[PDB]
Amino acid sequence: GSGEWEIIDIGPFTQNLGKFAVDEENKIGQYGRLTFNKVIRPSMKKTIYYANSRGMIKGYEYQLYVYASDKLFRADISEDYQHYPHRKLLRFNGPVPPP
Amino acid sequence: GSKGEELFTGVVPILVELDGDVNGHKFSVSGEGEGDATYGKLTLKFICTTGKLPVPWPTLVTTFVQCFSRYPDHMKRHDFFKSAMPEGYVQERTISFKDDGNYKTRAEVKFEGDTLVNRIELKGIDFKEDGNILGHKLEYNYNSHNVYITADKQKNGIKANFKIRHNIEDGSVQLADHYQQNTPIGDGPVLLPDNHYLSTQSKLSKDPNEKRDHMVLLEFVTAAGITH
């Protein structure tokens, strides 16, 4: 299961998600070494549910606009509480049009 | 009431140390936090210090300090756990997972200075390699339970029987059958209780800034089952 996208703030929690995305992308290397600047609006997340009738929260998915090295990227991050490591960078593409 | 009870009237720091061995997979966990028995409240964070935990975190919740239970005033003569303090008690369990392996645990719970310490050794055997436990098929959450306590006069302690209900990702629930015995470490007198139960509720979460394999635990435990 998975709910709908909801707008979230761009406070520390979100900025740290940005930082995570850039650090993970830096491990691949298809772009040059990126330096995190900031997550800008809009940031959004959707709730992920266990696939069963209880339907309790399994984790979350995030879609972020991230500035790194003065370029704007779209980062998708999944958070899954059941399995370590919980945070995984699904996608990281850029540069992209400003929202 | 007991002298041991006076050690719990405020916030008490807690340390938890576990050495485990499940189907030969060795692991260690350290936990820190605090307990406030006035409200039956426990807050703990556990870190696997040997890398990735080879079993699901929820299966270890009961193993990771019932002296922080809130005993209602009319029931305080029945609180064995605090009465055994500061010398402490040994807590032993067998935990049987339905159609899978079992844990055997031995823990010593006692004060070290002003800190309540729970030191545990855990042995797990007969687990199915792709069962719910070693296959990590448990949801990351935790149900509320009632744990019935009875006196064990010959060991000058208590025993308990209860079933833990673990949610499974496919929608089933797997029962973990707990057999428990507690005996005081010291030689002094302790309070032996009439039959009663502990009502528990637990919330599991994660620390967003933590990179190691870990569990954050918030728990409330209240004693009940004796009329006033």
Short mmCIF file of all heavy atoms in Angstrom, two decimals, chain A residues 13 16 20 50-54 56-58 79 81-84 86-87, chain B residues 52 136-140 167-169 171-173 206 208-209 211-213:
data_model
loop_
_atom_site.label_atom_id
_atom_site.label_comp_id
_atom_site.label_asym_id
_atom_site.label_seq_id
_atom_site.Cartn_x
_atom_site.Cartn_y
_atom_site.Cartn_z
N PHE A 13 14.88 18.00 9.10
CA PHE A 13 14.61 16.63 8.68
C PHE A 13 14.73 16.50 7.16
O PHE A 13 15.42 15.61 6.65
CB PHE A 13 13.22 16.18 9.13
CG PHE A 13 12.88 14.78 8.72
CD1 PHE A 13 13.20 13.71 9.55
CD2 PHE A 13 12.25 14.52 7.52
CE1 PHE A 13 12.89 12.42 9.18
CE2 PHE A 13 11.94 13.23 7.15
CZ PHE A 13 12.26 12.17 7.98
N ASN A 16 18.27 17.16 5.79
CA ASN A 16 19.10 15.97 6.01
C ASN A 16 18.82 14.88 4.99
O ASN A 16 19.72 14.15 4.60
CB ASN A 16 18.89 15.42 7.42
CG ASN A 16 19.59 16.25 8.47
OD1 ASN A 16 20.61 16.87 8.19
ND2 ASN A 16 19.04 16.26 9.68
N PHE A 20 21.60 13.31 2.58
CA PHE A 20 21.69 11.88 2.31
C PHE A 20 21.74 11.58 0.81
O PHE A 20 22.61 10.83 0.35
CB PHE A 20 20.50 11.13 2.95
CG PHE A 20 20.38 9.70 2.50
CD1 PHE A 20 21.16 8.71 3.07
CD2 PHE A 20 19.50 9.35 1.49
CE1 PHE A 20 21.06 7.40 2.64
CE2 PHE A 20 19.39 8.05 1.06
CZ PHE A 20 20.17 7.07 1.64
N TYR A 50 2.22 -1.61 4.92
CA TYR A 50 2.40 -3.03 4.70
C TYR A 50 1.26 -3.53 3.82
O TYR A 50 0.12 -3.07 3.94
CB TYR A 50 2.46 -3.78 6.04
CG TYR A 50 3.72 -3.49 6.84
CD1 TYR A 50 3.69 -2.62 7.92
CD2 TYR A 50 4.93 -4.07 6.50
CE1 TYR A 50 4.84 -2.35 8.66
CE2 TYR A 50 6.08 -3.81 7.23
CZ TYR A 50 6.03 -2.94 8.30
OH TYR A 50 7.18 -2.68 9.02
N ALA A 51 1.56 -4.47 2.94
CA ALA A 51 0.58 -4.97 1.97
C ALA A 51 -0.31 -6.04 2.60
O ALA A 51 -0.19 -7.23 2.28
CB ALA A 51 1.29 -5.52 0.73
N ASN A 52 -1.20 -5.62 3.49
CA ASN A 52 -2.11 -6.54 4.16
C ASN A 52 -3.23 -5.76 4.81
O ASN A 52 -3.22 -4.53 4.80
CB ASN A 52 -1.37 -7.40 5.19
CG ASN A 52 -0.73 -6.58 6.31
OD1 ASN A 52 -1.38 -5.74 6.94
ND2 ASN A 52 0.54 -6.84 6.57
N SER A 53 -4.18 -6.48 5.41
CA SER A 53 -5.41 -5.84 5.86
C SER A 53 -5.20 -4.94 7.08
O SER A 53 -6.02 -4.05 7.34
CB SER A 53 -6.49 -6.89 6.16
OG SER A 53 -6.08 -7.80 7.17
N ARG A 54 -4.13 -5.17 7.84
CA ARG A 54 -3.79 -4.27 8.94
C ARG A 54 -3.40 -2.91 8.39
O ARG A 54 -3.76 -1.87 8.95
CB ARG A 54 -2.64 -4.83 9.80
CG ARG A 54 -3.06 -5.69 10.96
CD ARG A 54 -1.84 -6.09 11.79
NE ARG A 54 -0.82 -6.72 10.96
CZ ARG A 54 -0.77 -8.02 10.70
NH1 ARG A 54 -1.69 -8.84 11.21
NH2 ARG A 54 0.19 -8.52 9.94
N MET A 56 -0.65 -1.15 8.36
CA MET A 56 0.11 -0.23 9.20
C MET A 56 1.29 0.35 8.44
O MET A 56 1.70 -0.17 7.39
CB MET A 56 0.59 -0.93 10.47
CG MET A 56 -0.54 -1.62 11.21
SD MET A 56 -0.16 -1.98 12.92
CE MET A 56 -0.84 -0.52 13.70
N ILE A 57 1.84 1.44 8.97
CA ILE A 57 2.88 2.18 8.27
C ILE A 57 4.19 1.40 8.18
O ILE A 57 4.76 0.96 9.20
CB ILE A 57 3.11 3.54 8.95
CG1 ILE A 57 1.85 4.40 8.83
CG2 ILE A 57 4.32 4.25 8.35
CD1 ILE A 57 1.96 5.75 9.50
N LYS A 58 4.66 1.20 6.95
CA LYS A 58 5.90 0.48 6.69
C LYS A 58 7.06 1.45 6.58
O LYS A 58 8.22 1.11 6.85
CB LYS A 58 5.77 -0.33 5.40
CG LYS A 58 7.00 -1.16 5.03
CD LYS A 58 6.92 -1.61 3.58
CE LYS A 58 7.53 -2.99 3.37
NZ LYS A 58 8.91 -3.10 3.88
N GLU A 79 12.24 5.17 2.45
CA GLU A 79 12.52 4.84 3.85
C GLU A 79 11.70 3.60 4.21
O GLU A 79 10.47 3.61 4.12
CB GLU A 79 12.17 6.02 4.76
CG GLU A 79 13.26 6.47 5.72
CD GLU A 79 12.85 7.70 6.53
OE1 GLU A 79 11.65 8.06 6.55
OE2 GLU A 79 13.74 8.32 7.14
N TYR A 81 11.24 0.78 7.23
CA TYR A 81 11.62 0.53 8.63
C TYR A 81 11.93 -0.92 8.89
O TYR A 81 12.61 -1.26 9.86
CB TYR A 81 10.52 0.99 9.57
CG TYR A 81 10.33 2.48 9.63
CD1 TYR A 81 9.07 3.02 9.87
CD2 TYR A 81 11.40 3.36 9.43
CE1 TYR A 81 8.88 4.38 9.93
CE2 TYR A 81 11.21 4.73 9.48
CZ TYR A 81 9.95 5.23 9.73
OH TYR A 81 9.73 6.59 9.79
N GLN A 82 11.41 -1.80 8.04
CA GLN A 82 11.54 -3.22 8.25
C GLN A 82 12.95 -3.71 7.96
O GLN A 82 13.39 -4.69 8.56
CB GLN A 82 10.54 -3.97 7.39
CG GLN A 82 10.50 -5.45 7.67
CD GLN A 82 9.54 -6.17 6.77
OE1 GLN A 82 8.92 -5.55 5.91
NE2 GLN A 82 9.42 -7.48 6.94
N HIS A 83 13.65 -3.06 7.04
CA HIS A 83 14.93 -3.60 6.56
C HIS A 83 16.09 -2.62 6.61
O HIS A 83 16.00 -1.51 6.09
CB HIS A 83 14.78 -4.12 5.12
CG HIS A 83 13.70 -5.14 4.94
ND1 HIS A 83 13.82 -6.44 5.40
CD2 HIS A 83 12.48 -5.06 4.36
CE1 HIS A 83 12.72 -7.11 5.11
NE2 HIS A 83 11.89 -6.29 4.48
N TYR A 84 17.19 -3.05 7.21
CA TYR A 84 18.38 -2.23 7.32
C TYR A 84 19.29 -2.42 6.10
O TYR A 84 19.55 -3.54 5.69
CB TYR A 84 19.14 -2.61 8.60
CG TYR A 84 20.43 -1.88 8.80
CD1 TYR A 84 20.44 -0.58 9.30
CD2 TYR A 84 21.64 -2.49 8.51
CE1 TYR A 84 21.63 0.09 9.50
CE2 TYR A 84 22.84 -1.82 8.71
CZ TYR A 84 22.82 -0.53 9.20
OH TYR A 84 24.00 0.15 9.40
N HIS A 86 17.65 1.47 6.15
CA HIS A 86 16.30 1.92 5.87
C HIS A 86 16.19 2.89 4.70
O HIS A 86 15.27 2.79 3.89
CB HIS A 86 15.74 2.51 7.14
CG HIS A 86 16.03 1.67 8.33
ND1 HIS A 86 17.07 1.94 9.20
CD2 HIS A 86 15.50 0.49 8.73
CE1 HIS A 86 17.13 0.99 10.12
NE2 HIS A 86 16.19 0.10 9.85
N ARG A 87 17.15 3.81 4.60
CA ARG A 87 17.11 4.81 3.53
C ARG A 87 17.87 4.36 2.30
O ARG A 87 19.01 3.92 2.37
CB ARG A 87 17.67 6.14 4.02
CG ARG A 87 16.77 6.79 5.02
CD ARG A 87 17.26 8.16 5.43
NE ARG A 87 16.24 8.87 6.19
CZ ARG A 87 16.41 10.07 6.75
NH1 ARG A 87 17.58 10.69 6.63
NH2 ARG A 87 15.42 10.64 7.41
N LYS B 52 24.81 -5.51 11.20
CA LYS B 52 23.40 -5.75 10.95
C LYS B 52 22.83 -6.82 11.88
O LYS B 52 23.40 -7.89 12.03
CB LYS B 52 23.18 -6.15 9.49
CG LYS B 52 21.75 -6.59 9.16
CD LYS B 52 21.60 -6.90 7.67
CE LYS B 52 20.15 -7.16 7.30
NZ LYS B 52 19.95 -7.06 5.82
N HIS B 136 13.44 -12.15 8.23
CA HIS B 136 13.01 -10.77 8.48
C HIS B 136 11.63 -10.46 7.88
O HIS B 136 11.48 -9.52 7.10
CB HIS B 136 14.05 -9.78 7.94
CG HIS B 136 15.28 -9.69 8.79
ND1 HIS B 136 15.41 -8.77 9.81
CD2 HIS B 136 16.42 -10.42 8.79
CE1 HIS B 136 16.59 -8.93 10.40
NE2 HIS B 136 17.22 -9.92 9.80
N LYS B 137 10.64 -11.25 8.25
CA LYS B 137 9.29 -11.06 7.71
C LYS B 137 8.32 -10.42 8.71
O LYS B 137 7.12 -10.36 8.45
CB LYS B 137 8.74 -12.39 7.21
CG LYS B 137 9.60 -13.02 6.12
CD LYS B 137 9.04 -14.36 5.68
CE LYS B 137 10.02 -15.11 4.78
NZ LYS B 137 10.44 -14.31 3.60
N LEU B 138 8.84 -9.95 9.84
CA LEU B 138 8.03 -9.26 10.84
C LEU B 138 7.86 -7.79 10.51
O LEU B 138 8.83 -7.12 10.15
CB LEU B 138 8.66 -9.38 12.23
CG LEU B 138 8.28 -10.59 13.08
CD1 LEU B 138 8.84 -11.89 12.50
CD2 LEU B 138 8.77 -10.37 14.49
N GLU B 139 6.65 -7.28 10.65
CA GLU B 139 6.45 -5.84 10.56
C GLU B 139 7.21 -5.16 11.69
O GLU B 139 7.36 -5.72 12.78
CB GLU B 139 4.97 -5.47 10.66
CG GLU B 139 4.08 -6.18 9.67
CD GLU B 139 2.62 -5.77 9.79
OE1 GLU B 139 2.33 -4.82 10.56
OE2 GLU B 139 1.77 -6.39 9.12
N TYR B 140 7.65 -3.94 11.44
CA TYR B 140 8.34 -3.17 12.47
C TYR B 140 7.32 -2.39 13.31
O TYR B 140 7.12 -1.21 13.13
CB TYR B 140 9.36 -2.21 11.86
CG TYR B 140 10.25 -1.53 12.87
CD1 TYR B 140 11.27 -2.23 13.52
CD2 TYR B 140 10.08 -0.18 13.16
CE1 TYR B 140 12.08 -1.61 14.46
CE2 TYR B 140 10.90 0.46 14.07
CZ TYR B 140 11.91 -0.26 14.71
OH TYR B 140 12.73 0.37 15.62
N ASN B 167 3.14 -9.12 14.46
CA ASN B 167 2.55 -8.94 13.12
C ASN B 167 3.52 -9.41 12.03
O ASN B 167 4.71 -9.12 12.09
CB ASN B 167 2.15 -7.48 12.87
CG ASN B 167 1.00 -7.02 13.75
OD1 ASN B 167 0.29 -7.83 14.33
ND2 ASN B 167 0.82 -5.70 13.83
N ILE B 168 3.01 -10.13 11.05
CA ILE B 168 3.83 -10.61 9.93
C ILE B 168 3.38 -9.88 8.67
O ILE B 168 2.19 -9.61 8.49
CB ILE B 168 3.70 -12.13 9.74
CG1 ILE B 168 3.99 -12.88 11.04
CG2 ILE B 168 4.61 -12.63 8.61
CD1 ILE B 168 5.40 -12.67 11.57
N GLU B 169 4.34 -9.59 7.79
CA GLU B 169 4.12 -8.71 6.64
C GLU B 169 3.02 -9.19 5.71
O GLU B 169 2.34 -8.37 5.08
CB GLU B 169 5.43 -8.55 5.85
CG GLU B 169 5.98 -9.85 5.27
CD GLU B 169 7.34 -9.64 4.59
OE1 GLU B 169 7.79 -8.48 4.51
OE2 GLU B 169 7.96 -10.64 4.15
N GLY B 171 0.29 -10.50 6.57
CA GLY B 171 -1.01 -10.29 7.19
C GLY B 171 -1.32 -11.24 8.34
O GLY B 171 -2.29 -11.04 9.07
N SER B 172 -0.50 -12.26 8.50
CA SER B 172 -0.68 -13.18 9.62
C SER B 172 -0.10 -12.59 10.91
O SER B 172 0.50 -11.51 10.91
CB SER B 172 -0.01 -14.52 9.33
OG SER B 172 1.38 -14.37 9.12
N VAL B 173 -0.31 -13.32 12.00
CA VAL B 173 0.27 -12.99 13.30
C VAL B 173 0.98 -14.22 13.82
O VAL B 173 0.38 -15.29 13.90
CB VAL B 173 -0.80 -12.55 14.31
CG1 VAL B 173 -0.18 -12.36 15.68
CG2 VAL B 173 -1.50 -11.30 13.84
N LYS B 206 12.41 4.83 14.64
CA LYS B 206 13.80 4.97 14.24
C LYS B 206 14.30 6.39 14.46
O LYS B 206 13.54 7.36 14.41
CB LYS B 206 14.00 4.60 12.76
CG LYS B 206 13.60 3.19 12.39
CD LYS B 206 14.59 2.16 12.90
CE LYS B 206 14.16 0.77 12.44
NZ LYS B 206 15.01 -0.33 12.92
N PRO B 208 16.14 9.24 12.83
CA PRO B 208 16.47 9.61 11.44
C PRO B 208 17.95 9.92 11.23
O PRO B 208 18.43 9.83 10.09
CB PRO B 208 15.60 10.86 11.19
CG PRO B 208 15.38 11.44 12.54
CD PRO B 208 15.32 10.26 13.50
N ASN B 209 18.67 10.27 12.29
CA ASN B 209 20.09 10.63 12.16
C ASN B 209 21.05 9.48 12.46
O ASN B 209 22.27 9.66 12.44
CB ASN B 209 20.41 11.82 13.08
CG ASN B 209 19.59 13.04 12.73
OD1 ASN B 209 19.31 13.30 11.55
ND2 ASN B 209 19.20 13.80 13.74
N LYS B 211 22.92 5.99 11.69
CA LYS B 211 23.32 5.15 10.56
C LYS B 211 23.50 3.67 10.91
O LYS B 211 23.46 2.82 10.02
CB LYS B 211 24.62 5.69 9.96
CG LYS B 211 24.49 7.08 9.36
CD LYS B 211 23.17 7.20 8.60
CE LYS B 211 22.76 8.65 8.36
NZ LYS B 211 21.31 8.75 8.02
N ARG B 212 23.71 3.35 12.18
CA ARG B 212 23.76 1.93 12.57
C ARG B 212 22.37 1.30 12.68
O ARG B 212 21.35 2.01 12.72
CB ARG B 212 24.48 1.74 13.91
CG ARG B 212 25.92 2.14 13.89
CD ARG B 212 26.05 3.42 14.65
NE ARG B 212 26.62 3.23 15.96
CZ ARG B 212 26.41 4.02 17.00
NH1 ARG B 212 25.60 5.07 16.92
NH2 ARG B 212 27.02 3.76 18.14
N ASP B 213 22.34 -0.02 12.73
CA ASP B 213 21.10 -0.79 12.87
C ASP B 213 20.64 -0.57 14.30
O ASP B 213 21.43 -0.74 15.23
CB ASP B 213 21.37 -2.25 12.56
CG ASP B 213 20.11 -3.05 12.23
OD1 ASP B 213 19.00 -2.49 12.22
OD2 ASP B 213 20.26 -4.26 11.97
#
